[PDB]
């Protein structure tokens with residue numbers, strides 16, 4: 001309506017997110033609140049009342065700040081984000097005399113992957129058969145990270161395991177036939193994920209041996 | 212929930228009703244209100260706020276009174292009851308901090324019939340053909356009334372004519388074969404209707420010759 005909110009929002013596990021709400025009703029504001037859908041019932045996250053002040057409820061206590069004291073600005077920030085913070089929220093303005101108005105914001109919780117780049121277990125002998133030259137892991141991210149490789153020296157093979165909390169670990173091995181042409185060149189693991197401000201990039205120089 | 216109301220209320224057109232609502236939810240009450248369901252949205256009927264006062268909305272203005280100033284008593288009275296007052300209402304208490312709680316009341320609007328008894332067009336002469344001794348009309352009642360007769364001097368015939376506002380008129384003629392035996396007798400019309408506390412009764416003494 002005149003309840004201005006962002007319709008869809010992502011939140012990174014263990015960081016902060018802002019639940020924006022501007023109230024332009026041109027009406028007398030009785031109180032304003034954020035609520036969370038639970039079945040058909042809703043549960044209160046935070047309340048502002050012009051005489052009774054703020055209130056934060058449930059497991060949100062200690063993790064919710066009201067941006068400012070204006071009754072027309074219902075924006076809050078949520079902190080120490082966890083999986084249960086996902087779902088549909090309602091910003092609500094109760095007004096006098098016409099009553100309530102609202103708009104919804106759905107929150108998706110993302111988890112940053114833990115990335116590591118490791119060398120293959122076997123040494124890369126020139127003229128030898130296909131060997132795993134490196135292994136890139138992006139562990140327990142939500143959703144699963146994406147892994148790409150730079151340096152066209154071979155081919156990629158990956159597996160993914162998803163977990164009850166809906167994070168996923170992806171393991172990607174880079175396979176190549178060692179040659180003279182590949183010696184001294186650099187292979188890069190590139191991990192893309194929506195919780196990342198920029199792609200994680202790890203690389204190292206190929207060591208190709210003698211005989 | 213914690214909202215005490217009556218599930219269903221009968222209301223008579225042109226009269227009064229109370230919509231009862233007692234609120235003791237345990238916590239600070241920021242405002243209380245009665246609302247009317249319109250589609251899936253609701254229209255406000257009346258609102259009581261501790262600092263802002265009473266407020267009445269729509270076509271309820273001049274027809275709604277709050278029973279008292281107590282925030283725990285949302286009871287109102289509705290006056291000059293009209294067809295549109297029919298429908299489903301919700302009493303609603305908004306509280307601080309947990310928010311609103313509500314309960315519904317459904318209102319049916321009845322219309323009292325206008326009842327009259329007349330002595331029939333032709334005059335009452337003996338040994339002859341059936342003659343209409345009296346006509347009883349319960350007009351534009353909602354729903355249609357029932358008409359019964361007391362005094363066992365003949366049979367009745369009745370017709371019903373419905374109207375767009377959902378009131379109906381029923382006209383009942385009482386026919387009899389006139390007899391010297393029937394003079395001094397009283398015929399009685401009895402009209403039954405849910406808007407009536409008792410049956411309406413109109414009677415008169417048959418005059419034969």
Ligand SMILES: *[C@@H]1O[C@H](CO)[C@@H](O[C@@H]2O[C@H](CO)[C@@H](O[C@@H]3O[C@H](CO)[C@@H](O)[C@H](O)[C@@H]3O)[C@H](O)[C@H]2NC(C)=O)[C@H](O)[C@H]1NC(C)=O
Pocket residue numbers: 013111139140163164165166167169
């Ligand atoms: C979502 O579920 C996954 C699957 O259980 C969670 O991953 C697990 O997290 C624990 C705690 O960090 C990991 O254990 C730790 O790592 C090594 C184990 O060898 C050890 O050095 C540490 O002291 C500790 O034991 C566990 O390995 C890991 N399981 C995996 C990656 O398969 C994940 O943390 C959950 N995420 C959230 C946000 O709840």
Ligand SMILES: *[C@@H]1O[C@H](CO)[C@@H](O[C@@H]2O[C@H](CO)[C@@H](O[C@@H]3O[C@H](CO)[C@@H](O)[C@H](O)[C@@H]3O)[C@H](O)[C@H]2NC(C)=O)[C@H](O)[C@H]1NC(C)=O
Pocket residue numbers: 224322350351374375376377378380
């Ligand atoms: C529900 O429906 C019927 C039909 O619209 C309404 O009945 C009509 O009521 C009016 C006024 O009560 C009657 O007409 C009036 O007659 C007087 C003479 O007594 C005259 O002064 C007025 O100008 C007007 O013409 C009319 O006889 C009556 N019609 C029938 C067929 O009975 C009824 O009032 C409606 N009721 C509600 C609660 O809305």
